[PDB]
Amino acid sequence: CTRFVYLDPHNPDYPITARSMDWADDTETNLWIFPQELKRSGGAGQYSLEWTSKYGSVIASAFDGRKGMASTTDGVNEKGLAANVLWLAESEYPKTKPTAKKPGLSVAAWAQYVLDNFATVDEAVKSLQQEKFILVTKQVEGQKRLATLHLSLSDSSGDSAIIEYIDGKQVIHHSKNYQVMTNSPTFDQQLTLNAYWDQIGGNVMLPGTNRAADRFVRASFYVKNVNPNKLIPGVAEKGKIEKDKADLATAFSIIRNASVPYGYSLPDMPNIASTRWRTVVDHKSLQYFFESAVSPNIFWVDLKKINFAPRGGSAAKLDLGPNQSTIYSGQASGHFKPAQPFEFAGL
Template structure:
């Protein structure tokens, strides 16, 4: 117990570093043993997110001037963009879900010192969605580190650093982090929650401590990442596993809303505390991608079977600028568009 408390204290003290967002990701098991992924995007400003549907067969590259990795998408996907410079959230036609959350401790090493092909951090999640149908496939391939990540600054000046959670239709899960230039992978269905700082091993230590306290007695209540990790972990374990698809979706949304930060709550001195600007729920069984803007009192979604372009077709985009009021299935609102370019130096 003393060891757990020392680890928890050490990790908590490390939170003085100022990460730039406070996102949360969870993996919910339904009563029919299917799985849904809920995610919140918290940011100091609106990151100008749009929704995109990309076809399989699409030629891609790592979006760096020299030595970029190249691939052809094996899967189609629906994604949420970030400043239209990065894929930060999405699901592919196999039900694989990728969520990128900010992690200030991220260190990718010096890409110039590597002989490996290069990949923009903005394309990291898209590479996974394009190439893999299961978590196991992604872990096996990425463990070989087939690329070196290039991570330039974001348009707002923040360091572009993040860790990635991946889940599939079987409930398998993995967390990928680059720490000290080394790739660290936590692979297993037990890794159902991810927030931000500190690194994932320290988050697990903090959560172990709170498990000894007991959620019915006390749960930490701030918007800091370690507190959110402990709170959503307890709520997720306590939530009913609903068999009805509509109730299962509602439960996933209720969990991610409960951990969200209200609009107007922000602290310029603590950028890790920022308002939630949108939420997503990915239904890996129904292949349905839900989106909820914090600025509108409505939910909309797309069914991947309806929206994904045919193999080799053109990408389509749902323009969310101006915060349009949308609800229900919105596949018909997407229009053909040239794909955005991933952030590069």
């Protein structure tokens, strides 16, 4: 997976987050509207963390019809906080067992928890630093193992953060400068990957392979060097709306450039996989775009057009069908249908 936040110097206060989901198999992803005040359980042990959602969200699920595997993978809430769970990471989660004072939170609900409770990256980082819970993952049927993952976050202010578990310890990097994040290697290592390429130009050469390092490097270069709203001699400066749209096109093109062609696989490197879909978050407009790479399907969801007030514990679901082939076009909030929140995987 690849994620970035794109910031146009010529169109400030208009951040756009984009992400690719990379996995070798169908993720059976659908979209969900989750209203305010849902009562949720962490899905861990007898000491599972508990909360009541404060903010409504639109999210992208994976395997939501399977008790064993259902998760929130990606989403944005009504305050503009976006969260992405990047798969095929190299995390080692805590050994320590959940206790009533420090209860468990399933990995499957990790992003949901954040989207449900916090309005900004900063807010979320402050709360996560207190280590109020233990992140847990399951023991599962063989062949193969599963997914390790880490969590990236972004704001309407353009802020960014990433949270990983290395040697069982929670490691947080928080800065508006952390515009690009890949699933691998660890973020400390990610931070040094550009240096060589900055020394020579990115216009001179870039690595082109699918490797996480290459995707990171490519995306870092384009995000810093592409301005679609440059002033041109003889051509009116564009209006705000046109500038916004151009930024959106730029973000889409970069995340497409960092995607992994469909069907590609390398036995030596099992952490490289087909990009199956992409999401793009326009924070200011609160618009959540979804794009299938498997089926022709691109559309968005306008959180301003959704009522996130409580619905007596029910929610809504946009069924994308097999291989995300069920076509929706334009603003799609109207096509969401009532449904009970799926259960998060855990124990």
